[PDB]
Amino acid sequence: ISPIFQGGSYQLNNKSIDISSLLLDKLSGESQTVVMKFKADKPNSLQALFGLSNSKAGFKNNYFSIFMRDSGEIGVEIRDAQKGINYLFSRPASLWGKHKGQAVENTLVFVSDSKDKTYTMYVNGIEVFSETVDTFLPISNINGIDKATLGAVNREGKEHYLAKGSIDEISLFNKAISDQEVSTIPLSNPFQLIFQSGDSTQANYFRIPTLYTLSSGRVLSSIDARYGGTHDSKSKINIATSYSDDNGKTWSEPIFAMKFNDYEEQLVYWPRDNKLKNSQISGSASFIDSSIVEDKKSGKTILLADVMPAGIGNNNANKADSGFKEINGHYYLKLKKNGDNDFRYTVRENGVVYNETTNKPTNYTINDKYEVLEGGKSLTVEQYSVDFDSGSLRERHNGKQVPMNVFYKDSLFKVTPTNYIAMTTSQNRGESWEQFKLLPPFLGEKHNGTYLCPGQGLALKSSNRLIFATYTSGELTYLISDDSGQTWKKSSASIPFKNATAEAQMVELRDGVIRTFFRTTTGKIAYMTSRDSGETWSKVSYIDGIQQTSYGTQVSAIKYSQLIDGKEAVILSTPNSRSGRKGGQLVVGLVNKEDDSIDWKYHYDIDLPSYGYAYSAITELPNHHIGVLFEKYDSWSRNELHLSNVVQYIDLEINDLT
Numbered sequence: 001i002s003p004i005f006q007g008g009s010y011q012l013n014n015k016s017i018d019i020s021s022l023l024l025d026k027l028s029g030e031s032q033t034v035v036m037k038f039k040a041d042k043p044n045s046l047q048a049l050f051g052l053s054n055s056k057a058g059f060k061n062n063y064f065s066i067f068m069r070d071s072g073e074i075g076v077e078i079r080d081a082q083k084g085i086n087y088l089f090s091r092p093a094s095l096w097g098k099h100k101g102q103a104v105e106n107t108l109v110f111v112s113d114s115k116d117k118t119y120t121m122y123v124n125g126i127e128v129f130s131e132t133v134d135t136f137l138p139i140s141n142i143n144g145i146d147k148a149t150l151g152a153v154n155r156e157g158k159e160h161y162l163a164k165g166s167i168d169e170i171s172l173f174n175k176a177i178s179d180q181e182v183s184t185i186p187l188s189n190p191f192q193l194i195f196q197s198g199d200s201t202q203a204n205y206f207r208i209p210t211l212y213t214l215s216s217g218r219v220l221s222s223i224d225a226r227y228g229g230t231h232d233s234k235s236k237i238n239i240a241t242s243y244s245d246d247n248g249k250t251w252s253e254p255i256f257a258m259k260f261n262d263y264e265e266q267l268v269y270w271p272r273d274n275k276l277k278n279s280q281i282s283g284s285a286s287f288i289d290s291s292i293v294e295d296k297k298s299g300k301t302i303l304l305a306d307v308m309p310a311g312i313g314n315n316n317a318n319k320a321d322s323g324f325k326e327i328n329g330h331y332y333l334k335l336k337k338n339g340d341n342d343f344r345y346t347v348r349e350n351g352v353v354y355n356e357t358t359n360k361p362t363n364y365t366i367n368d369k370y371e372v373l374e375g376g377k378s379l380t381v382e383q384y385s386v387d388f389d390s391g392s393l394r395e396r397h398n399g400k401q402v403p404m405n406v407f408y409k410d411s412l413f414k415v416t417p418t419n420y421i422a423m424t425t426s427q428n429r430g431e432s433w434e435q436f437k438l439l440p441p442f443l444g445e446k447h448n449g450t451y452l453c454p455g456q457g458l459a460l461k462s463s464n465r466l467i468f469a470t471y472t473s474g475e476l477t478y479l480i481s482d483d484s485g486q487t488w489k490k491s492s493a494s495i496p497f498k499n500a501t502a503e504a505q506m507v508e509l510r511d512g513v514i515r516t517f518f519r520t521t522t523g524k525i526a527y528m529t530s531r532d533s534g535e536t537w538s539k540v541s542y543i544d545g546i547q548q549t550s551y552g553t554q555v556s557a558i559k560y561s562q563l564i565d566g567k568e569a570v571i572l573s574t575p576n577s578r579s580g581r582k583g584g585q586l587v588v589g590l591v592n593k594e595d596d597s598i599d600w601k602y603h604y605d606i607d608l609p610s611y612g613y614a615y616s617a618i619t620e621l622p623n624h625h626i627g628v629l630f631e632k633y634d635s636w637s638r639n640e641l642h643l644s645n646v647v648q649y650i651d652l653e654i655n656d657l658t
């Protein structure tokens with residue numbers, strides 16, 4: 001239908017604008033829709049963009065506001081002292097500030113709907129909240145409203161929450177518009193979604209993005225499709241992938257690289273109240289932290305991830321147990337049968353389940369998908385679903401039968417409650433993925449598996465050598481294959497930390513010279529150098545000019561192909577902050593051929609220093625633009641848990657950085 005009111009080009013310079021004379025008489029009925037295109041790249045800590053208030057003395061709490069914080073959060077307030085109603089709905093990390101230097105125009109759509117009794121907010125096409133109340137307060141039935149304000153809320157005749165930005169365009173409607181209509185509002189988005197709520201993964205949440213340009217020009221991406229909110233394992237998490245054949249302008253409908261079936265794939269809205277936000281899926285096996293490379297020789301595409309048996313994450317993973325028993329040079333996967341309190345079985349050659357005590361093989365075997373067969377017959381378990389209908393989290397058998405897998409809770413045979421690493425391959429560049437294979441122990445029979453560094457593995461330009469960085473207590477443990485991933489050898493590089501999350505990423509500065517940048521506990525990014533193609537490693541140094549937080553953040557890096565100011569160039573993606581995971585940057589370094597030192601010459605501000613930026617993926621797109629897929633939020637912050645569509649992708653050019 002038609003806007004009862006429409007205005008545009010409002011400047012918010014810490015002075016509010018009065019539009020009462022225009023809007024207040026238009027307002028009628030109990031349903032309204034605000035549509036607001038606005039810019040704010042230098043906002044104050046807390047500012048109101050829009051306000052409906054009772055400016056009369058004695059009614060400071062009778063108002064409606066649409067506000068933002070300089071954290072990127074957006075919210076509304078609906079308050080009536082006489083009615084006894086005080087509503088505040090919001091979401092962190094809902095905004096953009098700047099992109100490529102210019103300020104971003106955000107597209108805000110707030111719906112107030114008296115039929116479903118529901119407040120819904122969309123920003124830049126994404127639904128950031130939708131709240132139902134039992135007692136609905138139409139934004140226009142607030143007692144004694146006499147003001148309509150932009151850039152403030154007019155309380156008791158003063159300008160509260162003074163704003164800094166602009167509203168290019170604002171429309172008002174005496175209707176609550178439908179979803180379908182909402183989707184037809186044009187956007188000015190500086191970004192796109194590759195993975196997103198409601199897509200084929202059915203995961204409502206995503207974390208830990210990766211990017212890799214393949215030899216065909218196809219760009220591939222892998223990610224954590226996280227179902228139980230944005231929690232680490234333990235949870236349900238699958239590895240999803242999607243590709244682009246047109247330099248990241250469009251992306252394929254995602255498919256699974258690694259998935260488990262013990263729990264259903266459920267698009268669940270996870271509770272954000274303090275009483276319930278730490279609810280965590282506790283019976284599911286899961287995957288977490290993927291890394292990808294292309295192998296020249298085979299043409300194969302290779303993906304690794306951490307594997308977690310039902311109910312397992314890194315905080316409770318059995319350290320001091322690789323999950324394998326060594327029998328004469330060979331590592332065998334161990335199993336526990338129900339009723340036993342010790343592990344008495346192994347998976348020998350041809351997946352035969354052998355009893356270690358009796359020394360007789362058994363009538364059970366383990367297939368390639370780690371499913372259990374008895375006497376050649378496939379066994380099954382019942383699937384679980386999660387819900388919050390009882391007011392708290394509840395995992396329960398949903399009726400469906402799925403292949404019994406030794407990583408599952410209900411399995412008759414179970415692996416060691418510890419962390420594993422697995423690989424899968426694609427012969428077709430992301431179109432399908434093989435059944436994953438578990439990797440062997442690297443640091444011993446009685447030492448838990450290491451942790452895959454998420455992002456890219458490295459394909460050395462002058463051999464068939466493939467390296468995947470992993471970490472454990474006290475060292476990076478690089479995994480090396482010279483045979484297209486069929487076999488693997490470890491290369492240990494000690495670091496001066498214990499229990500650090502040393503997420504690492506490598507660049508080749510020239511033939512056989514590998515620089516790795518990894519996350520520390522120091523507030524600085526560290527690095528080390530191999531000069532014999534990852535055989536041995538230098539001592540640890542640190543970069544000054546970038547700061548991280550004490551707990552740090554994942555860092556992605558690539559060796560750029562074109563020269564920049566005449567030099568070889570390495571690009572770096574990281575939050576630059578000591579407060580939290582915000583202030584994202586791409587940092588450009590020129591290499592000094594004399595000594596292989598790096599002069600970090602350019603810093604690109606991805607967005608505002610106060611807006612969230614966490615784990616990231618960069619890649620050189622086939623047209624020499626830079627593709628960036630990142631967590632646009634503070635994935636550490638306890639206040640920013642469980643947001644949808646905060647992992648976003650952008651296209652940058654080199655000159656944008658310089």
Ligand SMILES: O=S(=O)(O)CCNCc1ccco1
Pocket residue numbers: 232233288289306313314451501635636
């Ligand atoms: O810093 S955070 O990214 O929030 C924590 C990530 N933990 C990494 C991990 C690896 C295996 C299980 O968890």
